[PDB]
Amino acid sequence: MGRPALYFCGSIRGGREDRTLYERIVSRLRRFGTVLTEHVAAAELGARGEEGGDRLIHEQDLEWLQQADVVVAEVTQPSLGVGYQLGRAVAFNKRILCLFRPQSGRVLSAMIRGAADGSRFQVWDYEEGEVEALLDRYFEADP
Amino acid sequence: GRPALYFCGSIRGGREDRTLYERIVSRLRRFGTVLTEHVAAAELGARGEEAAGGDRLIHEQDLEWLQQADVVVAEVTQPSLGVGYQLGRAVAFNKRILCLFRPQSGRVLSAMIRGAADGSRFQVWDYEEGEVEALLDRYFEAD
Ligand SMILES: O=c1[nH]c(=O)n([C@H]2C[C@H](O)[C@@H](COP(=O)(O)O)O2)cc1CO
Ligand SMILES: O=c1[nH]c(=O)n([C@H]2C[C@H](O)[C@@H](COP(=O)(O)O)O2)cc1CO
């Protein structure tokens, strides 16, 4: 193995607008580790949980979060679950990268933007076309 | 002294439910001090144009209040990264937590919030707008 465990977060029931970007992010993360949460980018997944109970979703996810070496979150779409994941991840002292798209026209949550602290919690603005180059930079410097 | 109460509600995730946040915060004052009462301000927008100095100040002040809180109450109908983040940090602090969700919104509540419920220290209650005060009364007779 020897692969870093990568834990990806992205809105599901908060909205699936950014699913194609999640796919691109997951695809590139695979270059630098094993993505525990590839399901978040699945095209079939809907925003009404139509594809086990939520308790199982929560418990399995928290198990993966505690395995993770790095947490990567696309935080452009407001999502309770993505925020919740990042909260638990901070409490676990996980290394965290958050990716936000200003082109969305939104202003990113101050609880995420304001959580940026040192190298362990970073928040990067990006345009859709540079997502792979930014993930390379991030993981080439801090694998 | 008086219980310290920590209310969570979407700001930059959208202010659609602001009137309900005002009703929740107002009723919560019957049971203690609402540390995060600013979340209910009617004039508050979703773009952070009201505060200067950066989001780091908001994150740090909030976490200070969260650590002071005796009870956490979150209205989780509007998807919000910040509300989710607050609940994640609060779960890590093992805070007593009540979330209130409105199924009449047409949304399906995040599995990370719904699935975080253990029926005791983390409770998630469905409600309709008219009864929010009655439910807060029902929760704080015991809390
Ligand atoms: O079915 C699910 N499976 C799942 O793993 N999640 C996790 C992974 C995502 O990063 C995050 C999305 O939360 P939300 O659905 O509130 O937008 O929660 C969320 C859901 C539905 O909330
Ligand atoms: O200016 C702010 N002040 C503030 O206290 N918050 C906290 C309290 C709210 O319960 C929660 C709302 O998060 P959000 O803005 O991402 O929807 O975060 C959030 C913001 C803006 O994100």
Residue numbers in the entry:
A (entry chain A): 18 to 68, 71 to 162
B (entry chain B): 19 to 161
Article excerpt on this structure:
The cellular role of DNPH1 is to remove hydroxymethyl deoxyuridine monophosphate (hmdUMP) from the nucleotide pool. Hydrolysis generates deoxyribose monophosphate (dRP) and hydroxymethyl uracil (hmU) products.
In the first, an inactivating E104Q mutation permits binding of the intact substrate without cleavage. The purified protein (referred to as DNPH1E104Q) was co-crystallised with hmdUMP at 4 °C and X-ray diffraction data were collected from a single crystal. The six protein chains found in the asymmetric unit present as two full biologically active homodimers and two half homodimers; corresponding partners to the latter are defined by crystallographic symmetry. All copies are bound to substrate and are remarkably similar to each other (RMSD between Cα atom pairs = 0.128–0.406 Å), although there is some disorder for amino acids ~60–70, which form a loop across the top of the active site binding pocket. The core catalytic triad, consisting of Y24, D80 and E104Q, sits below the plane of the substrate deoxyribose sugar, poised for nucleophilic attack at the anomeric carbon.
